[PDB]
Amino acid sequence: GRLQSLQTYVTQQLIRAAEIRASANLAATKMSECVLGQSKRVDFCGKGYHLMSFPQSAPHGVVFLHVTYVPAQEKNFTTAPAICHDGKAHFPREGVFVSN
Amino acid sequence: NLLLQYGSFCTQLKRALTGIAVEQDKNTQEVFAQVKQIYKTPPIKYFGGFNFSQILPDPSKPSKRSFIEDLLFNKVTKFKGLTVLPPLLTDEMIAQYTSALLAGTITSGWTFGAGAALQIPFAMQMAYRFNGIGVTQNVLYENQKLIANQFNSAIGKIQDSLSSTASALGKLQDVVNHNAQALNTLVKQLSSKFGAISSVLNDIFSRLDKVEAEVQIDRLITGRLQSLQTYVTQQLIRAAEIRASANLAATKMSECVLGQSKRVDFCGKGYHLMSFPQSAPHGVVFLHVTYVPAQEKNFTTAPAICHDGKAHFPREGVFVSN
Amino acid sequence: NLLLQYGSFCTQLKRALTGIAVEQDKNTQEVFAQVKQIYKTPPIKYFGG
Amino acid sequence: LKSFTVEKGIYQTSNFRVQPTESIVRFPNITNLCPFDEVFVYAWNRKRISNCVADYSVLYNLAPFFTFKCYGVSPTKLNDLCFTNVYADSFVIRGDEVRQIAPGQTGNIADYNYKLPDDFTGCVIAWNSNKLDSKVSGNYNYLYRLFRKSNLKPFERDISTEIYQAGNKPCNGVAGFNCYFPLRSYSFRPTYGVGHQPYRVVVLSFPKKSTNLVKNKCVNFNFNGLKGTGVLTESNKKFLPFQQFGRDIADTTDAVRDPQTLEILDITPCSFGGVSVITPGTNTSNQVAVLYQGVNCTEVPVAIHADQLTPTWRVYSTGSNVFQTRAGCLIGAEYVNNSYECDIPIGAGICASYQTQSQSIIAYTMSLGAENSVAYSNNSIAIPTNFTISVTTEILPVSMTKTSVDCTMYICGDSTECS
Amino acid sequence: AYTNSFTRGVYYPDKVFRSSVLHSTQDLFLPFFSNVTWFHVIDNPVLPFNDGVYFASIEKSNIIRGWIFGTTLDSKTQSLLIVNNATNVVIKVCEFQFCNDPFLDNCTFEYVSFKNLREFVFKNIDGYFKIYSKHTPIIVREPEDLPQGFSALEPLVDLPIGINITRFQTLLALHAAYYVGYLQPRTFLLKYNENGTITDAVDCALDPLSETKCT
Numbered sequence A: 001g002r003l004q005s006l007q008t009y010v011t012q013q014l015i016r017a018a019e020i021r022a023s024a025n026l027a028a029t030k031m032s033e034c035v036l037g038q039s040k041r042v043d044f045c046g047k048g049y050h051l052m053s054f055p056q057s058a059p060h061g062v063v064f065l066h067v068t069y070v071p072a073q074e075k076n077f078t079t080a081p082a083i084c085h086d087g088k089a090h091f092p093r094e095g096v097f098v099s100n
Numbered sequence B: 001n002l003l004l005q006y007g008s009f010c011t012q013l014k015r016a017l018t019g020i021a022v023e024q025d026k027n028t029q030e031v032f033a034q035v036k037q038i039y040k041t042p043p044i045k046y047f048g049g050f051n052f053s054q055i056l057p058d059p060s061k062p063s064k065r066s067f068i069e070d071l072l073f074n075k076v077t078k079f080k081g082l083t084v085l086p087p088l089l090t091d092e093m094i095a096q097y098t099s100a101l102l103a104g105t106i107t108s109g110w111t112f113g114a115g116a117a118l119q120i121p122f123a124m125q126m127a128y129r130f131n132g133i134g135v136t137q138n139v140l141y142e143n144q145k146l147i148a149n150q151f152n153s154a155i156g157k158i159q160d161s162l163s164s165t166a167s168a169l170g171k172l173q174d175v176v177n178h179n180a181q182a183l184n185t186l187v188k189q190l191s192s193k194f195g196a197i198s199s200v201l202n203d204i205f206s207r208l209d210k211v212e213a214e215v216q217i218d219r220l221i222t223g224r225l226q227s228l229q230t231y232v233t234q235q236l237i238r239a240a241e242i243r244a245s246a247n248l249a250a251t252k253m254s255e256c257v258l259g260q261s262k263r264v265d266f267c268g269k270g271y272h273l274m275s276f277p278q279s280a281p282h283g284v285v286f287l288h289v290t291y292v293p294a295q296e297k298n299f300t301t302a303p304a305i306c307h308d309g310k311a312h313f314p315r316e317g318v319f320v321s322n
Numbered sequence C: 001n002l003l004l005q006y007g008s009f010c011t012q013l014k015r016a017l018t019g020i021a022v023e024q025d026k027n028t029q030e031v032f033a034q035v036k037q038i039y040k041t042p043p044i045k046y047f048g049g
Numbered sequence D: 001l002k003s004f005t006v007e008k009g010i011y012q013t014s015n016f017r018v019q020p021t022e023s024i025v026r027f028p029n030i031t032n033l034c035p036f037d038e039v040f041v042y043a044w045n046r047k048r049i050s051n052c053v054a055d056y057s058v059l060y061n062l063a064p065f066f067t068f069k070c071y072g073v074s075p076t077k078l079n080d081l082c083f084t085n086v087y088a089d090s091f092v093i094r095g096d097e098v099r100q101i102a103p104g105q106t107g108n109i110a111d112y113n114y115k116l117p118d119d120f121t122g123c124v125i126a127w128n129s130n131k132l133d134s135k136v137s138g139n140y141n142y143l144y145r146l147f148r149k150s151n152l153k154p155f156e157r158d159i160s161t162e163i164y165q166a167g168n169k170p171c172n173g174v175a176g177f178n179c180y181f182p183l184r185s186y187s188f189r190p191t192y193g194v195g196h197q198p199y200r201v202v203v204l205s206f207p208k209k210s211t212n213l214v215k216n217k218c219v220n221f222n223f224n225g226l227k228g229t230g231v232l233t234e235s236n237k238k239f240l241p242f243q244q245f246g247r248d249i250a251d252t253t254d255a256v257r258d259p260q261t262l263e264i265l266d267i268t269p270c271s272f273g274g275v276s277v278i279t280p281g282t283n284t285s286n287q288v289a290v291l292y293q294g295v296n297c298t299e300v301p302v303a304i305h306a307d308q309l310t311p312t313w314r315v316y317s318t319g320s321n322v323f324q325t326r327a328g329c330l331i332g333a334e335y336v337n338n339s340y341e342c343d344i345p346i347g348a349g350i351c352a353s354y355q356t357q358s359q360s361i362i363a364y365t366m367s368l369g370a371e372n373s374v375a376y377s378n379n380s381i382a383i384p385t386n387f388t389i390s391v392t393t394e395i396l397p398v399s400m401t402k403t404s405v406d407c408t409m410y411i412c413g414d415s416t417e418c419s
Numbered sequence E: 001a002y003t004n005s006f007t008r009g010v011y012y013p014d015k016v017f018r019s020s021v022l023h024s025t026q027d028l029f030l031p032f033f034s035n036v037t038w039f040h041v042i043d044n045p046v047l048p049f050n051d052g053v054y055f056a057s058i059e060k061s062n063i064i065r066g067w068i069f070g071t072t073l074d075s076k077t078q079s080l081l082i083v084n085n086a087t088n089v090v091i092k093v094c095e096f097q098f099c100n101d102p103f104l105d106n107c108t109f110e111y112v113s114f115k116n117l118r119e120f121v122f123k124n125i126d127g128y129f130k131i132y133s134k135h136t137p138i139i140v141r142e143p144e145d146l147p148q149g150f151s152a153l154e155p156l157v158d159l160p161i162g163i164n165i166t167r168f169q170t171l172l173a174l175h176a177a178y179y180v181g182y183l184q185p186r187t188f189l190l191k192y193n194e195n196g197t198i199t200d201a202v203d204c205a206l207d208p209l210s211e212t213k214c215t
């Protein structure tokens, strides 16, 4: 009975160690891709367009402070994909053709 | 009273199964509840010639499930001390989440995932998807009807594939099959004798004296407790695997439905454009819309060009001759 | 004959080990079989130096 | 929880476990009343009463039979006792020799006619039969022995009429003094006393009834030795005429056939379900709701705590606020049409909270989010003119507590024998 | 002589109703496609009993009338005798024999109950004698021998006699063909329909395909 009671505890510790190792691999990936660089992955490091991150220690863990850029004040505009000029179709190199 | 001599084995299995049952609802919340506002489409369904009638919800059905979701729900097909708890989120709520995500994706693109939803015409949105993968946006506006026709044909092929081949949902069938097989084996372990004289307790307690009838009942108790422990351990391992799959599903949803992916072969073969979520029995189905180059041609190339002693390098693209 | 009375434990372990043995080949196929056609090199081994 | 303070949430405590109070026993009515009416000196009237269940209660309860001595078994257990053979020897015995019929006792008949062992297993029933076995100027139909060469042993088949020789003169078929016959007559008369009166002695040398049926109620039942507990519900499963029990996929007793009437009864083993406790924290209040999992709300007051049950309370089970969810029966919470965020989950889109509608536990459908609609047009765009900078917090575990186990010390305290 | 038993000899192992299921059991069964012994009536030699006897009779004139069982059949110990006398069925355990040559014109037990095919199974477990039977009409001729098909066998008579049986002999009427097979311990996967009738069976030790089916 005592050997079975020990074996159950060791099996549950093995399962919990696998889960904790998966979380630690995710944390290492987050640190490498967001603290040591800039992430283009959507919602990987903070909601919005990710700017940077800061790591902080914690009891049995890590805490990331994600600095992100969020657009705030919106406005309607009348848009068009291209513009005719002397029989030529002009397309924007970057940005949006708008009109007020 | 004989089972009371064993202690906390009879409650730690309850604790582990309660943790698994909470973790399933946590997985469903993390996969589907990624949008804060339930968006909905305008009644005009002209999205630049693109046809979305198969994935948008149909009001003719009682539930708010689309045609593809109805096909996925149709393609996918205990009593003795066992209870099956219902999920916290019903299929109507899951369909409302998928409808809100798909409506937000169609009407805005990146912006409903990056913050507030920003309306934009769908031709301009797909032109920006083309500009995100190294193709200039004039190629779309000179081929918009062809792109819309190809997308409509590729959407229409999926219904035929799902109606003909029902073996595509192998993982979602295997989840139900594994749970049913585990429950059936756990129930059918009751009739085993485990080295005792009988599998019925009344026969042991009526045909035998107490002072070793207790030993026979102890043998039966030990065998049934071992079977329960084996079932709980297998459920724990399967729950860990399902949690890993749910984390991958939430990652794909966030990085492909809510945005555009630059990772190679993460969301469909080829150059990724966008994606669609659909609910499914114990799962999610992503329709990945991708761009694949088709018709090759040979050309003679060069790295740079001399002109009056100056080396000219291309800003964008390669040099071809004919 | 005494072991026949215990139940379906042997079938449980056979099913689990069969699933593991299928999963190993699935892992090998998923890692390596990512190409459609077997490409072969040109006979002249000169790639930019 | 093994703690005096309960935090906010849902907690599972026990099971429902509706219990029975009644027992049904059912058997065929072929009791096989043994032919004791056909029974009740040397060539025995030994009738092998077998292949039937013997009812000695008739002989015990009717008027004429008087003596009910029994040896080997108790005289009151006879109707509960089964036999391979009931050796009944109906005899006509004089009362002075009736007093000698006992295990291990000697006497005239017990020494010269037949013997009984000290460990004799049987019963003796006797009554005076003067009007049937007494004749004028003596009854000579029964002959007994007052002489024998040597004392007997039990169950020794001895039927003989040879002359016993006691004198020196050889008799050899001619009787006389010291040339004695075995056979002598007691010569029964109606004028004799009780010690000389003949008794009709039967030396019996060596079953559960069926009760009425109760349907549509969860009772304990027994059908031909098949014991169970469940609701004996009328069904329509087509049994084969030799088939008497029905089984499920899981080899459990799903249907039975009554041995008296050929009806097919489906069995449902009462009702069970987890009794979850929905509470806010005890730091705030002590109001408690109770959820029975998988149980209809119209059967909890039927299986109320007055009925035998593993719940034995009535504070939060006496009706009042009763709601039927797909998880089961929720008692102690009021359904509110307003939808909020999920505070304490229940199942199938139902949550519960502690709100001032003063404060009480309410139940509601969960709210997915705020309804929104995008003003989509094919020539209109929306462009931000400003921004904001957001610093969010994400918390991740990395490593847990490292442990180590001394197995020898854990299993054996300080025992070298255990090591 | 020998002929092919096909899929005959399947009986109900217990009085348990099961609806639309595949149930695996291990009992004394007749193996599929086994050599069943052929006999024609113009004899009736004494044959062993072993673990069990499967009997098949194809006739219209009802020549076959009964059986006699026993270890020695020398009128020294108990010997079974089952005879249908065209009005009833008589079962006796008497020592003596009805005729010196067995034909049809102290006992501790007594019990009274090519168009025709009758199938029987006699087995003796812990002394208890079990008889399974199936009476059917057939159209086909005596060539093809046993009919190639499926038919379940239903129990009729259980006996508490406790009599050892090693030899047996059929008893005819004098003023038709039969087949004798032997039961062996086999594992069968029986198929139960909605009404509990055994619709089909699979012999787990015949070929690897049925071994895979039982697996």
Ligand SMILES: *[C@@H]1O[C@H](CO)[C@@H](O[C@@H]2O[C@H](CO)[C@@H](O[C@@H]3O[C@H](CO)[C@@H](O)[C@H](O)[C@@H]3O)[C@H](O)[C@H]2NC(C)=O)[C@H](O)[C@H]1NC(C)=O
Residues within 6 Å of the ligand: B049, B050, B051, B052, B053
């Ligand atoms: C986008 O695709 C849908 C579906 O392909 C088009 O809707 C119409 O869908 C029905 C079936 O749902 C098609 O079949 C028709 O069914 C009706 C009712 O059973 C029947 O009376 C007709 O004879 C026909 O069989 C129908 O062809 C289809 N309509 C068209 C014009 O194809 C929808 O029109 C598509 N939208 C765009 C903008 O392409």
Ligand SMILES: *[C@@H]1O[C@H](CO)[C@@H](O[C@@H]2O[C@H](CO)[C@@H](O)[C@H](O)[C@H]2NC(C)=O)[C@H](O)[C@H]1NC(C)=O
Residues within 6 Å of the ligand: A074, A075, A076, D373, D374, D375, D382
């Ligand atoms: C752009 O114009 C549209 C015109 O429809 C605006 O949509 C309306 O916004 C108001 C204010 O919230 C709502 O009361 C209406 O119900 C909206 N119309 C519809 C049809 O839903 C939209 O808000 C404008 N956007 C900006 C940034 O000015």
Ligand SMILES: *[C@@H]1O[C@H](CO)[C@@H](O[C@@H]2O[C@H](CO)[C@@H](O)[C@H](O)[C@H]2NC(C)=O)[C@H](O)[C@H]1NC(C)=O
Residues within 6 Å of the ligand: D027, D028, D029, D030, D259, D260, D261, D262
């Ligand atoms: C037991 O005896 C009774 C005789 O009454 C039989 O049970 C039923 O009794 C009623 C009384 O009128 C009859 O109308 C029925 O025909 C009887 N039979 C049934 C099946 O209901 C019963 O047959 C006897 N045997 C058993 C085994 O119960």
Ligand SMILES: *[C@@H]1O[C@H](CO)[C@@H](O[C@@H]2O[C@H](CO)[C@@H](O)[C@H](O)[C@H]2NC(C)=O)[C@H](O)[C@H]1NC(C)=O
Residues within 6 Å of the ligand: D296, D297, D298
């Ligand atoms: C719980 O019990 C109620 C009993 O009222 C069921 O509701 C229906 O009630 C009507 C009476 O007004 C009955 O005629 C119906 O037969 C009941 N329906 C059913 C399906 O039995 C209610 O459905 C029950 N809930 C369950 C069984 O989940």
Ligand SMILES: *[C@@H]1O[C@H](CO)[C@@H](O[C@@H]2O[C@H](CO)[C@@H](O)[C@H](O)[C@H]2NC(C)=O)[C@H](O)[C@H]1NC(C)=O
Residues within 6 Å of the ligand: D385, D386, D387
């Ligand atoms: C864009 O938003 C910012 C943020 O509010 C405005 O800047 C000022 O910010 C301070 C603190 O952040 C506030 O106390 C002031 O009230 C804001 N000014 C005003 C006029 O509201 C900024 O003005 C906004 N507009 C732009 C940049 O055009």
Ligand SMILES: *[C@@H]1O[C@H](CO)[C@@H](O)[C@H](O)[C@H]1NC(C)=O
Residues within 6 Å of the ligand: B306, B308, B309
């Ligand atoms: C190309 O241009 C360079 C520089 O103008 C010159 O030296 C050379 O002769 C030209 N022709 C070739 C074949 O390289």
Ligand SMILES: *[C@@H]1O[C@H](CO)[C@@H](O)[C@H](O)[C@H]1NC(C)=O
Residues within 6 Å of the ligand: D335, D336, D337
């Ligand atoms: C909820 O709505 C139903 C339907 O209109 C109504 O009958 C019921 O009284 C409402 N309950 C509350 C608490 O508003």
Ligand SMILES: *[C@@H]1O[C@H](CO)[C@@H](O)[C@H](O)[C@H]1NC(C)=O
Residues within 6 Å of the ligand: B044, B046, D377, D378
């Ligand atoms: C653009 O949208 C308007 C409604 O806002 C609609 O009437 C019109 O048909 C659309 N344009 C095309 C080309 O369909």
Ligand SMILES: *[C@@H]1O[C@H](CO)[C@@H](O)[C@H](O)[C@H]1NC(C)=O
Residues within 6 Å of the ligand: E002, E035
């Ligand atoms: C069955 O009989 C045939 C013909 O007599 C013979 O060839 C075959 O070997 C026999 N099979 C067995 C298993 O006895």
Ligand SMILES: *[C@@H]1O[C@H](CO)[C@@H](O)[C@H](O)[C@H]1NC(C)=O
Residues within 6 Å of the ligand: E076, E077, E078, E079, E093, E094, E095, E106, E107, E108
């Ligand atoms: C016939 O009687 C003898 C002596 O009692 C007995 O051994 C034998 O078994 C009897 N025969 C039968 C068939 O019962």
Ligand SMILES: *[C@@H]1O[C@H](CO)[C@@H](O)[C@H](O)[C@H]1NC(C)=O
Residues within 6 Å of the ligand: E085, E086, E087, E088, E089, E090, E112
């Ligand atoms: C057949 O045997 C039974 C039982 O011995 C008897 O009742 C019946 O009359 C017999 N029939 C004939 C035709 O002899």
